């Protein structure tokens, strides 16, 4: 890696010259460099622990031990970054001296004093200095970022390894949870990282302050000292204010997150919601919640207003009160223009320190908190790194207090089938997990030679977020026949058909979390597939289904078939393999009788069984409102148009002081002129604050109404998370941190134009050099927008699977400890951790390369503006604007490009306008061939199917073919359709929610074509086969409607046997329906929906195929509700198990992908005959 290029990043050239042609992948990203490989960085830091193992006063480690480690860990390279930061800031001060030396020499008409003569000389010295000044600051930024990158994994590995020695009794799910270590990755690493991003500056920024003060003092003196203290002492007002901003952010998330959870609630069961036709109330609850969310973001704006304001006003507010003190209150010194310009030059320089200092103080304190949160975590209880026998042990599920099981001996040699049974809890999975060694074995011995002289599945499912076949893999090689000898041997093929892509589907997170009869079944699959010797399966009949338990007996018969002298030692509860078992159970509350033979046992007990241009107009010009957007224009214009003009006065009035109406009268004019922008800047801060507040209020209102009427076929076709990705991230983008980018950029780019416009007006042949120059400025930017985008979205796709690895590492901790797969997963830890760090490198690479290449360009401006500006002799005050803006180009094009880059990312959120607005269909009501129709009630259950020819999506295949059917009042049609072509296709279709390609549907006599679907589909009962539990209040779960009752609400739900089962409600008839059906049953969950079906008062309850019913007695109570509570209408008995066809009134077995036969009466035909089959 070559050194002057290691200065200015020349290796990035061919990278980005690559990047204009091809898009960029992780393959286009590289290997890690030798030191940047994370395990090396981990390696040195463990040595730093061993170094302070020599100290060992109280070595938990602890925080005092940590920072003594970390300083001697990374500090040498940190010193090098600090040294460049110092020397650069020192030459940061030298430029102002150069300005002073020019104008002082140019008020006029070998020795070093003579060598200090010429503005030729001093300007060239200025240029050649300001190369280094504008270079070593981008060394010192760089190396410090290439320090925190080397922090990241070298912390994260220590974290992850302590997870590899973590113990799990109550602490692992109590005080600290998966989230509580997850944010500890997600925050406290970055708290450390941004600390070491800023760690030089806390050493150094006050030295920049004090030497800025002293090099102001040798310009004015006591007027310097009285002027400086505003800008010095007023920066911790930012430390006051941003504290309130953090307080507002705490107010933000605490009010946003539950709302977003309720948005996910409204979105997940959106099909049932529009099936309930309940978009209005469900959206209205989020709408009035949003009113308070806006009221919180109101203060978020009021906080973020003055941050900008005091960041911008206090420069001028210092500079004027500095000068009026030098003019009025003191009046001693003559005021040269050289003074007056370079005074402002330092004033421009010193702020870019000063309003980072609060963020420094914040981050330093936050990280010093976070190291304690790291430490007091990190010194918690380890997991005691130290045939299947147990020789008389004393095990404890607890840590070293009260034991759980003593005197426990067991033995399981090879070639053996053994379960363990008893009472749950005491062996919920307990004694098997005690065999794992995941308990405080206070005494006794145990033998596998597993550690020193292994498969498992947990009683809770801990799957992985991957492909389903990859979840079946669980760090395995491939054998697709053996996989067919597993997956088909598990019979997950129906669940694989329920998956959209089967073996290539999306298991874990972002997928339908099915039952353990799928999920834990897939775990038992990866268990059996694992090609291990000994297995420990856990009570899978509790997770299985009934016929799945029959297949689980068959899977046990495939297990022992697959047990080619294996040692699978399961445990269960049922009496199924109580006949078929090699050895026996032992659990009463501890060691029950042994595994040998139930002959001499108590078996009687067991025998009981480019850019985005128009999108900104879609942001603003469609939604801003014109008058405030015009104020956003004009206030931005007229602020800077008087700001640089205040500097234009600030030269020439002192040029008259260099000469000699009244200049003291000129000064108070200038004073109030400086006060004018000080007045304006408040309205400038209030503009974008109020603007983005109004923008996001209507934008979120619009997207709410946009999704509020969309058809359900879309939502089945839409991946629901891709919608909520527009609601979670993009909304918070548009609210919390969209417009500050704009307010920065509108402050930025005008000043970028403006300083050029000044130096143009100074020298009329400036622009002749600018025109080749700004070419280069543009073409570097034009390449740059490609790269910084592709890095930034790369970043976005990178640390997310990194912490996803953590979450699975938390949850499936036990099972990887069982497989002893830490070596695999520490490797695959790195395999992400690397790709984070190398992406972060190339991000922070072009983060440097851009501005340093643009910075030399800015320096070229300086010299050219100087050399042109020599001819003002051939006036002299008007030089001083040139010099003061020549040096002030840099922070401008620093931000003026980078923010324009990040605006493109900020626009990528509001790209989802088209995902919202353009996607719009399905006017629900409003067709309405009558305006007057009280047959939304109907007392006549004679529906009709007037040769209705429906298509599914009007895309691939029809559902019917001219079905000229009808219905009779009381004719409860037992629905019998195709096993894979027409099952659900006649209920939501009967709610007109599909592409009925021909044929009408007469309802209460009249066709349902032009009728209010909001009125029709809400006054029609349908108890579908999805668990519909709207979280909230109990009356809100029961009756969130207009004519809500409590007597009838307590009547039919007692007829549903829920208002008497939950008669001990916490709030009674207005109780809280907490968690959306996590405390109530799975059966009364639907019985409350049956009471809602009573509440519609048109009880033609179109039920669905309730294939997941736990109690068949509860389904018989539902049959009693079909008997007693269904008031003799056309119950469309959709049945995946045709057992419920036993109560047929007038069925229509319309099947084989078609309309087979009207099944009434006595139709025990080839489906009802094969209903037993």
Numbering used by the authors: 222 to 330, 346 to 622, 678 to 744, 770 to 925, 994 to 1044, 1059 to 1272, 1277 to 1575
Give excerpts from the publication:
Uniquely, the sulfonylurea receptors SUR1 and SUR2 lack transport activity per se but instead are devoted to forming the ATP-sensitive potassium (KATP) channels, wherein four SUR.x subunits form a complex with four subunits of an inwardly rectifying potassium channel, Kir6.1 or Kir6.2. KATP channels are gated by intracellular ATP and ADP, key features which enable them to regulate membrane excitability according to the energetic state of the cell.
Recently, we found that carbamazepine (CBZ), an anticonvulsant structurally not related to SUs and glinides, also corrects KATP channel trafficking defects and surprisingly is effective only for mutations in TMD0 of SUR1. Here, in both the RPG/ATP and CBZ/ATP structures, we observe strong and distinctly shaped cryo-EM densities within the same GBC binding pocket. However, in the CBZ-bound SUR1 structure the cryoEM density corresponding to the ligand has a size and shape that markedly resembles GBC, with one end pointing towards S1238. While the close proximity to S1238 is in agreement with our previous finding that mutation of S1238 to Y diminishes the ability of CBZ to both inhibit and chaperone the channel, the density is too large to be fitted by a single CBZ molecule. Thus, an intriguing possibility is that CBZ may bind as a dimer to occupy the entire binding pocket. Alternatively, the result could be explained by a CBZ molecule having multiple occupancies, and what is observed in the reconstruction is an average of the ensemble. Due to this uncertainly we did not model the CBZ molecule in the structure. To our knowledge this is the first protein structure determined in complex with CBZ.
